[model samples]
Target: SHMPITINNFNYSDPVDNKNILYLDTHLNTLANEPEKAFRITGNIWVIPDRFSRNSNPNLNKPPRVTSPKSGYYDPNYLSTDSDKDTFLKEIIKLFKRINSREIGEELIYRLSTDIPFPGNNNTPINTFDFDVDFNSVDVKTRQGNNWVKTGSINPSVIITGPRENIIDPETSTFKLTNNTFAAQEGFGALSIISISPRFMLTYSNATNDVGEGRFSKSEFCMDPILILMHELNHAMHNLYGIAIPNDQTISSVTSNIFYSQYNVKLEYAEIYAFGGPTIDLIPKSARKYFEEKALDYYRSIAKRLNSITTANPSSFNKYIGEYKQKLIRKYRFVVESSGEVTVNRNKFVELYNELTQIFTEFNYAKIYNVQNRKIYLSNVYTPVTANILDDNVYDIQNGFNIPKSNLNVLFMGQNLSRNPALRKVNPENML
Candidate 1:
């Protein structure tokens, strides 16, 4: 029952209509110097929840969209479309400016409010997000209505809102984000694009659903806002071998199919904090091992990453970056628990937590490769593969990475499910 996979990688060069990929690299690289991760966060926050647009409200649960809701496409002429389109492009700048005004932003509060304060939060984070300063107090503005908005804001409550939140016998790969908007008129999920650059994943309105990509109406692209930004960041961390999701979790849950390249290799997650480990030293021996380490680290690093991001000088945090990191609870990160595994290593946990600080320094030179060129440098982007041992097109599992013909367990993060099984050895006395 081996699942088929499509092997591919990042291509930085201009591939066909891949100008966006090139542009995104150019755009993000320029702002690389400052605390761009915060910018990246704000970017992810906004993008993730809105992965694809459901002009008619797509992700409901019970019944799903039959066709593409994102089909109509933002006409650019309509103000809502134009306004939505404009916000899509300019959210970053708005986020940085938001960073400026927050007087009690990062440093002061971090220093003043210390459980054992480190004085500075610049590129340096304190594992636990200092809830001292209410970010809500910080006021910033975007082009939305010309008023001071706390650009660093995302409605106090940001959790995944959809149907699959809970299921009785939820099939892994087959689970759908079913949404029955109406009785006769079905509600469709749209593929809305939060266009950024460097990737060529296309928009087909509302083609796919939670099952995969087609469910989205407009199909968002790029790391423009934090939501989408974080999603890709998670993938990059996994793709480049930074983190992992368990095999039992992915393969069994939704039949997720990630490889070693996607696991925690060189990257870290926007990777917010610095440490989370097995330290590039821990290799994936089995899906079980990968999933265990991933969940442990997920629980440990998340809060730390959030604390590390802030509104600093030359640049400040933005919207998408926030969305992306937080949205991970749904996007991925739940493999360990789904398969009923338990983690036992404590030093491994400490070792992983210890590395959180070193990451900021790594960022100093880590992002040197461009996504599009990197894509080309790596392998085919989503070169299709057979699903399982079958040859059917419907169940085919194609991807954008050049995965191998073997099993190389990868890491999973975000929804760090804490439920690991602790089966005792039956040979405690017999063998002894």
Candidate 2:
């Protein structure tokens, strides 16, 4: 439901055509001097109560429906007080300011302002944008003497309104007016109402500590409110520019398919933009070692399983086993010698480690549709292959495998992949 607001009491209906040209023109000119004000949140920041059921309305498919809070917005405990609400607003503004000061945030804001053209006028780009936050009031209900009573009414107003695209010409790079006058007529720009879970506020202190302490670990970043807000803001920018955010299926498919390296990078655009860099860079050294060891252990387990199959039926499985061994040597960068000694190229191991761990993390908590179109927890797709690879008490190999009496011979190597031409052409399929 769209709730129109008054902008200096500007009239939308024209004396002749009943159009809102005056409203759009006036709003643009008003914010032309300070375009940054358009991006700022000028409305109320509502705080959603804790423990509210996200799936209260089955009719609305979106998770944590901030738009429709009436369905199941009741939670007796952890109701947000005025003090909590004020603190949330303060933290949000603080974080927003912090992000705006960063290079990546500045670039994002610049693109939002310059790239998205103003509705009805391409030459005069959008100079004003405002969005409200629904952090507190969400048609909340409270129980009184075995009766659940409604407390506040849901805000009919939305944050974003208008024809999302065709505002900017793709080929000529010019903005033009669209047929939809509702957005421009109402003075609503590209943004809409956004909601945040109160859980962010609850954990705000810890997140601040982690960032302030210089703990740039993945876990810390995941909990940081600043990064989370940046992520949501990135999504809003995508909507404004008509960029499609990749769905879970697309992300899963891209990550699962090794050949789609280019697509993989594109799919991670939001995450990279939010975090200010590729997630791999944020991975702690300890976590990297864990992934490396786990990857090696998985390969070792697979080799052992295949070896047993060959031992049982040498004629039928020997060829396949040989092929797999060669694949490990060539594709996985394992060093295999004629004397049955197997060592790992330090560089290759790290590459494999990064790749496998990336796949693991991407699929870990995601439910994705397979090529068969069957819905399945994608984690199951990789778990079987990696399950039981390491024991509970496995020693953390601080320094990876070093072969005795050979300074150059190393296993579980941490060096970069070998660039030798001879190694590149080795075909696993044709190997004996």
Candidate 3:
């Protein structure tokens, strides 16, 4: 009935300490095509302090890590040695510097718009035969190009109604929880605004991720302040329903995703030894290396795809011959393991990164076309009983889907039609 959308942008100190909420402003300019008040952009990028990360911490002395203590965050296990800690910190610093230098925001924005199809037999473009050919151009345009308009979204102020807070101090690199005996209560629980990718981005989970790049307010892109803000804003949009606070955060732990789980996905046993140690739990140097290595892998994969695309390949990546996948892996392995030039690394990384962007390009297209997509409804019983997502419907759920006594992937991703969102259903048995 009411359609005058007005987004209020605000930033706290935790997520972005000194940065102002400029992304909300940037969002309006980007969303110039909207006909509805789906989003009313904000002006201030939220900032937050580590100590006050959560919006409703009320009591954080009993955080998961404080009691468990084995998590990589804040424990001696992460930076077991000063050199190791320095190395980790250095990587983080270098990442920011790179973001600041290259105007990551713009680069990311551009990437979201990119698309490429694998060279199927006879060089058939991947977008050829759909499970059901969508006959709607109204939604088709959003898929072909401008897909970024779908992912790495930039709308702000849509997070106010959801759980808001930054899980800051509890997970920061410095806040160890051992003898220090510091109560995890002394941390920030700030709420975040973000988009849903329907799957993983930074890693391989194929699940929606929200932490590091959520709404990109506090991060610096290519080490460039303006660029970082812009890049982050883009990431914010990719996540649907901007700030999916309405959704459940209970990620099913049953994925083979290397980073999502505590398992080590080391390609070789040596990596495990090099990264693993005496600690009961470790981030495993493999985790970081593997993550970086995957980045490199993706970087090359894209490069090969692009070469195929530009050189008469047109919509297909078949022109530049040779086992492209093999070629990519060889080139990256050689450089990262041997040729010691990060510039070359980045050059290759960028090339590969862009080459494979077609997947996302199609994802945007898929959403626009409503391709084989399902309207996911997560059951909300795991959250605090007082949370609003869970209300009546528990009885309906009991009679319908044999709701898992504990957390289940099918349970988390799918939903119980019976429950009203006010109750936010979940089974705390597994803390999923």
Candidate 2 stretches greater than 4 Å from native: 1-80, 110-189, 197-222, 246-249, 253-432
Q: What Cα-based lDDT does every candidate model obtain?
A: 0.22, 0.27, 0.24
| TM-score-best of 1 and 2 | 2
lDDT, candidate 1, equals 0.22
Q: Write the per-residue lDDT of candidate 1 for residues 1-432, one digit (tens) a residue.
A: 012211122221213231111111111112122211112222112121112222243231332322311111112121124343233234332322222123312221121111111112222243222222211111122334543222433211111111121111111110112341110011110111222311112111111112143434322111111222223322223321223232222211111111112222232222222112222232334733544455455444443444354532223334344543343322222222444332224564445423322332122111221111111111111211111111111111221111222111111100001111111112211110
lDDT of 3 by residue, 1-432 (tens): 012222223222113222222112122112123311121122312221112222232332334543321211112132234353233222222222222232232233332222111222112232231111111001111233543233222312112111112111111111121333111111100112321111011111121222243444421100111211222333222221011111121223221221133432223221111112221023245553454454454334434343343232322334344444343334332253344222226665545433222222222322322211111111011122212112112211121112243232242222222232322322233221
Model 3 spans with C-alpha error above 4 angstroms: 1-282, 310-432
Worst 10 residues of 2 by lDDT: 380-389
Q: Tell me the alpha-carbon RMSD of every candidate.
A: 24.0, 28.3, 23.5
- Name the candidate that leads on lDDT: 2
What does the lDDT come to for candidate 2?
0.27
Candidate 2, residue 163: how far the Cα is off, in Å: 26
